[PDB]
């Protein structure tokens, strides 16, 4: 068991693997090479294990952030799309699949948080974070609040914290400078301070989590929420007349949500790399390939410019892409684990009064660059 003359692909069960299996039938038609799609349990855990022994699938699909650790252990083949193929995708997407200068995967789909609002409570969404407090006082007059989102996890608060200058790790060449951390600058300080002021001025509760904000928006109790494409199906059900738009600016700067990129990487151990690259570049990364997959399960915004332009007729998808273009690609390096825990702590601490903003961030900065 170690491939040879066929293709085996691994993709999560929550994706359009039936559509991907259909691109595969088309490939098997003009080639005779059979493609096999599977969606094993915790495949992102299983991958590292089987690949380390020269086993596993030829190709694996997962968010880009996980690819950094895989690449580190030499589990992924270096890819070499030519200039021409490269120009078919949004430039920023190639930055997500670079591991110390080397291209280690093809970008497929893009995901980023967006501002979700209730069209019945709010005519036009606010363009600015600075105007939320005032809006909240007007909505409170009717027993409604302006905004509710998950305050517990930094993934959700980062857009605001980063807006005016924060960043996880300085990136400038397909490479991340791990001693250039941006959680303690004035930028991040301005952002967290604004957030803290929201909670103390009672425009927001420090204990709002994922579940609470979600139920609140879905019950029409709050005018806005911050969430991703995975949340749409729940709102639909709710029967709320919602819109998806660009996040608000802060100090005139765009909010900077982290961007996750659904990526396809080739097993360094596969004997079929040429077959993989041909399947990927000429079957899958085409309007017809993305379409067959999308038909099975939506991909959200896609990296292929041509198909994205078709998809963007859905204003929710257009907004997703817009936010993503203004966001921060999530670093694929191992030091990112330090960032999660540190920044998680800094925010809960500053929010609960347990520490000041200056203190909370100084500490987090310290634990990351430690």
Curated annotation (Swiss-Prot):
| Pfam families referenced in this protein's UniProt entry, alphabetically | SBP_bac_1
Q: What domain of life?
A: Bacteria
Q: Is Protein biosynthesis among the key words of this record?
A: no
The family database entries (PROSITE patterns) matched by this protein are listed as:
SBP_BACTERIAL_1 (PS01037)
Main localisation? periplasm
**GO BP annotations, alphabetical order:** maltodextrin transmembrane transport; maltose transport
Molecular function terms from GO: carbohydrate transmembrane transporter activity; maltose binding
Q: Which UniProt keywords apply?
A: Periplasm, Signal, Sugar transport, Transport
Localization annotation: Periplasm
* GO cellular component annotations of the record: ATP-binding cassette (ABC) transporter complex, substrate-binding subunit-containing; outer membrane-bounded periplasmic space
The family database entries (NCBIfam families) matched by this protein are listed as:
PRK09474.1
Q: What does this protein do?
A: Part of the ABC transporter complex MalEFGK involved in maltose/maltodextrin import. Binds maltose and higher maltodextrins.
Assembly and interaction partners:
The complex is composed of two ATP-binding proteins (MalK), two transmembrane proteins (MalG and MalF) and a solute-binding protein (MalE).
Q: Spell out the family assignment given in the record's similarity comment.
A: Belongs to the bacterial solute-binding protein 1 family.
Q: What protein name is recorded for this chain?
A: Maltose/maltodextrin-binding periplasmic protein
Provide the species name: Escherichia coli O157:H7
Q: What is the lineage of its organism?
A: Bacteria, Pseudomonadati, Pseudomonadota, Gammaproteobacteria, Enterobacterales
């Amino acid at each position: 068991k170690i491939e040879e003359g066929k293709l085996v692909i691994w993709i999560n069960g929550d994706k359009g693997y039936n559509g991907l299996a259909e691109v595969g039938k088309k490939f098997e038609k003009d080639t005779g090479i059979k493609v096999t799609v599977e969606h094993p349990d915790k495949l992102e855990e299983k991958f590292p294990q089987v690949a380390a022994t020269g086993d596993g699938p030829d190709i694996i699909f997962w968010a880009h952030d996980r690819f950094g650790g895989y690449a580190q252990s030499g589990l992924l083949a270096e890819i070499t799309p030519d200039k021409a193929f490269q120009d078919k995708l949004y430039p920023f997407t190639w930055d997500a699949v670079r591991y110390n200068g080397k291209l280690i995967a093809y970008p497929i789909a893009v995901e980023a948080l967006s501002l979700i609002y209730n069209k019945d409570l709010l005519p036009n969404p606010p363009k600015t974070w600075e105007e939320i407090p005032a809006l909240d006082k007007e909505l409170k007059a009717k027993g409604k609040s302006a905004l509710m989102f998950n305050l517990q996890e930094p993934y959700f608060t980062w857009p605001l914290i980063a807006a005016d200058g924060g960043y996880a790790f300085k990136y400038e060449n397909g490479k991340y400078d791990i001693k250039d951390v941006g959680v303690d600058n004035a930028g991040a300080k301005a952002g967290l301070t604004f957030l803290v002021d929201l909670i103390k001025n009672k425009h927001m509760n420090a204990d709002t989590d994922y579940s609470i904000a979600e139920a609140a928006f879905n019950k029409g109790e709050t005018a806005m929420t911050i969430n991703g494409p995975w949340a749409w199906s729940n709102i639909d059900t709710s029967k709320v007349n919602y819109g998806v738009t660009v996040l608000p600016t802060f100090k005139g700067q765009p909010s900077k949500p982290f961007v996750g990129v659904l990526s396809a990487g080739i097993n360094a151990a596969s004997p079929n790399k040429e077959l993989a690259k041909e399947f990927l570049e000429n079957y899958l990364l085409t309007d017809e390939g993305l379409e067959a997959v999308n038909k099975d399960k939506p991909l959200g915004a896609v990296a292929l410019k041509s198909y994205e332009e078709e998809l963007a007729k859905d204003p929710r998808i257009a907004a997703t892409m817009e936010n993503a273009q203004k966001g921060e690609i999530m670093p694929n390096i191992p030091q990112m684990s330090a960032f999660w825990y540190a920044v998680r702590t800094a925010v809960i601490n500053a929010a609960s009064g347990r520490q000041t903003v200056d203190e909370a961030l100084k500490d987090a900065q310290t634990r990351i660059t430690k």
